[model samples]
Target chain A: MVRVKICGITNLEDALFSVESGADAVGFVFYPKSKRYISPEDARRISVELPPFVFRVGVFVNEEPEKILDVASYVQLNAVQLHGEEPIELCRKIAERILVIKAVGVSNERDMERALNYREFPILLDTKTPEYGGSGKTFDWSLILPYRDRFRYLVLSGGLNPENVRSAIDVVRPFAVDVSSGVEAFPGKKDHDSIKMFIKNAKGL
Target chain B: MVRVKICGITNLEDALFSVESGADAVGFVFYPKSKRYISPEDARRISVELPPFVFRVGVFVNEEPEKILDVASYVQLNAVQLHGEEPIELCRKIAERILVIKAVGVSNERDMERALNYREFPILLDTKTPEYGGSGKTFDWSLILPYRDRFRYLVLSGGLNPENVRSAIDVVRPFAVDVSSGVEAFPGKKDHDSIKMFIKNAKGL
Candidate 1:
């Protein structure tokens, strides 16, 4: 089944809404500078209360191994998402312990070439902007769809919303769809209605 | 009198300690993914309890104008610090509302040259790394000292600690010294003793 991953979740409410609304994974940005950043203590607190079966993913950007491991163990994350200039070795090292979701910043097909290097992980193709993850801009789906068969799984992020996500799914048929600012009322606050509708729309098919 | 700014404050205890320690300013990182991030509501709560004379600075990376201003309004920051690739125009645009502390990430003299364009605003000379800020590595003081007279005021940062801060002061004599990881027991957790010792060392003269 196609999955929905609502990334950059900040609070208990958003986390609950994500899984309850049928999202496969709820992403908490462990990157501290992100507007949707959740502290490890808070993430751990909320994650511990979460029911099993929902994947708890933590988003990191160019973080040190010790720090990543610290947060992973602290929050008890099921997977880790890398969204910076981290080396492939680091991904392999991390992948040894947990699922590593490598986020590639895409402007064109050339950017997707790096995805071919990682066979063990899922690749999330987000828009290329100075901001690492949340640019609220989408790349050309046509630019990436041709290479879908190469990866273990593909996740489409950036500029996804309740309205556009269904089309994104129709076009890419990705393993998962990740959203942050699209369903947010503001930077760190999620709109419940939008969350409900986005998950419903993406999973309905 | 030389001023001390305990940057990357994440909680009420640290914010209060910065003020109570005779420091001139307290920094709340608004960048959501920062190791030392605090929510606007949380920042506002802490800032409200602070003394009138203490300067509350909000640290941002490549954030949008509306989000910056919205957090500024909510947190009631006295100043804003830009730590990403934001242009001089964004600095000019934001300075119109509140004091703008332009953070210049320096590795060489050419990096220092960018500081000359912002004569109206203070420039925080932080060491440039893959991470935007808080790398906990200091740059060559000699590289920045000669250019000190060119800016409105200079705030020194990166790998500053209670031990080396005195020499950093004697060598550069900056308007203020900013410390983040130096005073941290861990990321997002402040060490009270280190905070006290750091403040005393910076302001004792």
Candidate 2:
């Protein structure tokens, strides 16, 4: 079964609901600019209440490595997703402490080729937008097909919703699928019904 | 009696010791560059263990208002000390949620003159240095005597130790005294004996 990760989690109720709804992991946005950003303190409170097996991922933009490590340690995150212009050296340093997911914004074949350089860590293919993730826009799935074998694991993201998630999964056959705005009622609040449906569809339940 | 706050706390042991030694409040440095910087996760772990009455202050440099609020809420801090070149507008916005203390580096009469603009919040006077606080150098106390009554409560810091705390308090007649390196065996660790004696001297015991 394909893994389902619900991103942009803010409150305890939403996180608990996502986990109960069969999400493999839940993501918290540490990037302050995102409407979905949550304080590290609030994230920690919710993180402790979560089940041990449920992965907790921290999402960051172009941030300092020290701050990233600080927040990751404080939140007790299982993995960190770099969604900005972070260098390979920073990724290697952070990978020593926790799992690293490098986000590659794909608009064309060249973007897919760029993902090859970050083969050392898992790569998340998101749609290229002026801002970071949660654009709710999908890229051409065929663009990722040629270079798919070069990377270790590919987590399909960008413009994924319950309606299109199953098709995206069947075409990409990704290791995992991530969703943020597609499952949200607003920016930070998650819609419980959409969350359950998305997971069920992605895992073909 | 004047209050004593032990700054640069990195571990729970040092924080608990400071509280047991009769310190009024304990400070955690959030500035990433400081040798005493403590991750918000570790800070939160220690903050919860502290008694209710003990004030928990989170120290920050010139940081975004959003991040300061995030860390403060996460660590459950009682106050936030701005030890950088933060503007009055930013201070006022943060003051709406938590207590704000602005640090002023004093070298001569002109530096003391600059502190008058921040009268809306309590001001901490420290020795002027290229870096922020924990300089371990004392400025001339007489420079502050002329402008003492112009503001509200003043916090005396920079180069304060057990031996000279009483004298500095006597001379400055400050509402509180803050010390970091003076009571530390190293940068982030506290010397328990020095903490106890400094609090004793500040309180005129």
Best by lDDT: 2
TM-score of each: 0.49, 0.50
Alpha-carbon error at B76 in model 2, in Å? 28
Residue-level error in angstroms, candidate 2, position A182? 0.4
Deviating ranges (above 4 Å) for candidate 2: A131-138, B1-205
What 10-residue stretch in candidate 1 chain A is worst by lDDT?
A: A130-139
Q: Model 2 fnat? A: 0.00
Candidate 2, A21-123: lDDT as tens digits: 7676799999998899999999988876664335688999988999998997677676789999788999988865556789988877887778788987888
Against the true structure, candidate 1 has what lDDT? Answer: 0.76
Task: Evaluate residue A158 in candidate 1 and report its C-alpha lDDT on the 0 to 100 scale.
Answer: 83
Top candidate on TM-score is 2
For residue B135, model 1's alpha carbon misses the true position, in angstroms, by 5.9
- What digit string (tens of lDDT, one per residue) describes model 1 on residues A154-187? 7888888888887778888887788888898998
